[PDB]
């Protein structure tokens, strides 16, 4: 089984523009949205059909009420941050929590907060402590770290509850999450002359492409495209290296994807 992760994201905005919501929260299983809530709908709803089809209205009803409580908790917490920063205008506050089931069976877990898109507090569930980036964060840490019970709760949740949910969702969504769609990899030349290694049509989006020269990993000489959504459930990417006019070389594209390795030599 490949690596899988579950994540929940919260975003709050102190002075949102007309329409723009002040609170949003989205869940992901790997790269798929599975849940959404926001301060305008005020309803939690699946963004995945295999979610909607496997959880009864009682679940959405229950989590709708919780998110209405969390929205308010966020409103309050962001009010507090902005006043201890002495900041005017609109500012943002964010949370992320979740876990990974790695391929070998071991697990990871993580929880952190952001202010204005930079790290604010990061949890370490092994020392049972918070890391603070500035003195506004330091004051939240002394407060949060005094409820030894509440940190014990986070460690239990990240390690047992998160992993349990993720196992449950992997089964609901397995036809999506556990399929393999191998990539279609070609090569071509572009004006200096460049070798572009293009792949497309593949799922999951975890793929490694690299150019090798004469059996050595040309690196710092490689130029990596990003992995991009195609719009239909699959992804494309590329990597380019720059050809030498003065000496021939044996260039070859290497692609790894879901336990399969691919090599295209350039004649």
């Amino acid at each position, epitope marked *: 089984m490949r690596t899988h992760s579950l994540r929940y994201f919260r975003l709050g905005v102190s002075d949102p523009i007309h329409g723009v919501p002040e609170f949003i929260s989205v869940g992901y299983v790997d790269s798929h949205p599975i849940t959404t809530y926001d301060s305008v709908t005020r309803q939690k709803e699946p963004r995945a059909p295999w979610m909607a089809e496997n959880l009864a209205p009682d*679940h959405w*009803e*229950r*989590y709708t*009420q*919780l998110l*209405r*409580g*969390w929205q*308010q*908790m966020f409103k309050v917490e962001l009010k507090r941050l902005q006043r201890h920063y002495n900041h005017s205008g609109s500012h943002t506050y964010q949370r992320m929590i979740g876990c990974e089931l790695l391929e070998d069976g071991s697990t990871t877990g993580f929880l952190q907060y952001a202010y204005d898109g930079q790290d604010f507090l990061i949890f370490n569930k092994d020392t049972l402590s918070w890391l603070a980036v500035d003195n506004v964060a330091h004051t939240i840490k002394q407060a949060w770290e005094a*409820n030894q*019970h*509440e940190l*014990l*709760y*986070q*460690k*239990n*949740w990240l390690e*047992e*509850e998160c992993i*349990a*949910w993720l196992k449950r969702f992997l089964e609901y969504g397995k036809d999506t999450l556990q399929r393999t769609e191998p990539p279609l990899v070609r090569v071509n030349r572009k004006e200096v002359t460049a070798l572009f290694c293009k792949a497309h049509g593949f799922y999951p989006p975890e793929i490694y492409m690299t150019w090798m020269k004469n059996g050595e990993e040309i690196v710092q000489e490689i130029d990596y495209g990003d992995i991009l959504p195609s719009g239909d459930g699959t992804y494309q990417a590329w990597a380019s290296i720059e050809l030498d006019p003065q000496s021939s070389n044996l260039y070859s594209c290497h692609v790894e994807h879901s336990g399969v390795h691919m090599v295209l030599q350039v004649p």
Partner: antibody
Amino acid sequence: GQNIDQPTEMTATEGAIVQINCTYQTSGFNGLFWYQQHAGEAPTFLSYNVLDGLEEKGRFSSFLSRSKGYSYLLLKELQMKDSASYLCAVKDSNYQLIWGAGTKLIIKP
Amino acid sequence: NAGVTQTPKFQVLKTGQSMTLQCAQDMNHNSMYWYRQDPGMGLRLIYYSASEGTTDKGEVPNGYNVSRLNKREFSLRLESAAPSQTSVYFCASSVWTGEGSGELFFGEGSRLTVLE
């Protein structure tokens, strides 16, 4: 089917040790609470366990084994003022409390 | 520091009659609950209020309804009292709901007997 099961009633003697069990079969687990309820009065919070092990709070200790679905509340050096019901409660996967029926503790002077 | 103040402490009702149970908390809590205690059973949630602005049912809502009037108060309403509603009722509150370790703070209880 979630259930919490605690013994109906217990009798110990003044100055002795008593140990109140609570076993749970839940849908997930976010913590197990102990509350104290004097007759005619309101329940008050005693303790909380979410990891494994034992925590000491004065004359009362409370234990938790997540693997076994099991917690006890241990009352040392019993006193008549310890006569009450003891209520155990478990937060499930959806953060909603499930309440045991309660254990009446009777103290022989 | 009053804690959780609920009233009345005692009440006798006839079948079919109406009654509202008052509950207030001065602790600036966000979540409030209405529980029903009966012999030989664990507590049972009737309605709850996760924050000011929202309520939802619990395990045993039929025959009851509620109003989160403001941040302080949370009222439970019987509207056609029935014998099976004879019970002791406890209002409760916590700082938040959906936190993990937060304890509940209880009122003194309200005891209702419903008679034909």
